[PDB]
């Protein structure tokens, strides 16, 4: 299957226990990167069957499916792979925002001297 | 800048954030790495960047030895400061393999194969 390809990428990458590649969302139109999470093993084998975008969360020890709440689904257009095979950039058609803070992606802040602000071309496409 | 950031990417013991350097003017991802305090510190003011190799274990300046070197023009930073995208100028090509971007291949069905827009800059 599809998702079986998985066993030529290496998961190199291990943060408390669980052994990860690196992942990129970027708009498949616009170019833009929309965020950067990691994805173990079994979050890229969905990824590949379903055509939707699963993430492997540090934080909350699990694999989960982008809008699994806020149905802002990330549908995956195409998948490339970094040279070693250890990260990948998936190409997505994001629905409503990457970010839980409402813009559209996670990178919404640049940095500005000493410090961060705002983009002013950023859009928050919803409130939370 | 750094007290603004929040490096916690641990791996081999040293604190860490991702960077994703993208093409300025094409949009197109170029590289993945890490980057270390000293890293970014140093991006930020010789404006070319640095990474930090986990493999090494040592500060990396892209290009350093090849002359490819990237030049930033803007950094962004993620909602939770664990991770930047360096808008670059590159020099070259970011891949020694000669490609223009590491990410010059694609799953496609059941295998990796070279995009049909993968251009390769230079003969490694």
């Given at each position: 299957?599809?998702?079986?390809?998985?066993?030529?990428?290496?998961?190199?990458?291990?943060?408390?226990?669980?052994?990860?590649?690196?992942?990129?969302?970027?708009?498949?139109?616009?170019?833009?990167?929309?965020?950067?999470?990691?994805?173990?093993?079994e979050a890229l084998r969905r990824t590949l069957e379903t055509g939707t975008a699963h993430y492997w969360?540090?934080?909350?020890?699990?694999?989960?499916?982008?809008?699994?709440?806020?149905?802002?689904?990330?549908?995956?257009?195409?998948?490339?792979?970094?040279?070693?095979?250890?990260?990948?950039?998936?190409?997505?058609?994001?629905?409503?925002?990457?970010?839980?803070?409402?813009?559209?992606?996670?990178?919404?802040?640049?940095?500005?001297?000493?410090?961060?602000?705002?983009?002013?071309?950023?859009?928050?496409?919803?409130?939370?």
């Amino acid at each position: 299957s599809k998702g079986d390809v998985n066993i030529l990428l290496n998961f190199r990458h291990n943060i408390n226990g669980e052994d990860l590649i690196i992942a990129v969302a970027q708009d498949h139109e616009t170019g833009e990167v929309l965020m950067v999470a990691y994805m173990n093993r079994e979050a890229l084998r969905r990824t590949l069957e379903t055509g939707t975008a699963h993430y492997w969360s540090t934080s909350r020890g699990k694999l989960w499916l982008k809008g699994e709440s806020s149905g802002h689904v990330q549908r995956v257009k195409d998948v490339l792979v970094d040279c070693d095979g250890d990260a990948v950039v998936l190409k997505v058609e994001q629905e409503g925002g990457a970010c839980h803070t409402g813009y559209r992606s996670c990178f919404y802040r640049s940095i500005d001297g000493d410090e961060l602000k705002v983009r002013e071309d950023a859009v928050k496409v919803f409130d939370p």
